[PDB]
């Protein structure tokens with residue numbers, strides 16, 4: 350009820366409140382909008398970056414926790430080639446429900462097939478799409494509530510230390526300021542083994558992203574601020590990349606995207 354003037358749920362605090370992600374984040378619209386253009390170009394670039402990290406570089410191990418998975422599984426497709434077990438997490442219940450629809454292969458679930466086929470092509474067509482989605486489904490062990498602003502982001506859910514914490518397009522959305530952002534990155538560290546990987550992909554200098562006409566706050570960090578927060582949260586950056594490709598103005602006012610792979614100090 351600020352009617353676009355300001356992101357939804359931000360009128361008082363200046364950033365979209367977390368209760369907004371339980372109310373107004375509609376996973377189906379979210380999926381319809383970004384994951385069915387500038388949006389598909391970004392998706393391609395994320396997919397190729399994830400392929401490279403997990404399949405070409407040595408980002409490998411036993412357990413990966415995906416932080417702020419949303420209703421989406423495209424971030425996990427190359428990861429399952431490299432990680433025995435995957436935990437997907439998100440603050441929004443409706444997102445977790447959408448994920449569980451997908452995991453059970455409910456007919457009512459979102460069709461990921463063309464994104465799955467694209468990952469298969471990237472991976473050299475060793476298998477086709479249906480075989481790949483099913484390897485991913487069996488790799489996904491847990492679907493949990495996450496709050497990255499909490500020092501136990503997963504609460505009392507016991508999990509062994511992870512080899513990788515992944516987070517795509519989430520931290521910008523979740524963190525109203527840079528102290529919270531740095532704190533969230535430290536929080537995610539609590540889940541990682543000594544020297545575990547941390548993989549973040551997110552938008553640069555983006556202050557909102559739309560779901561159709563629903564406006565959500567994003568933390569408008571540049572490259573230097575991202576680098577600073579990662580370092581202070583107790584990590585050594587292995588590689589950091591920035592692309593200039595942006596979403597359409599009608600989805601986000603971002604100036605490019607970043608991806609990084611860091612290790613816990």
Ligand SMILES: Nc1ncnc2c1ncn2[C@@H]1O[C@H](CSCC[C@H](N)C(=O)O)[C@@H](O)[C@H]1O
Pocket residue numbers: 367370374416417418419420421424439440441444495496497498516517518519522523
């Ligand atoms: N405090 C918080 N802790 C964990 N997740 C949060 C959060 N606040 C917002 N989120 C989540 O962050 C996600 C941002 S949209 C990104 C979703 C998906 N990873 C993708 O790549 O497209 C949403 O799923 C939203 O529910």
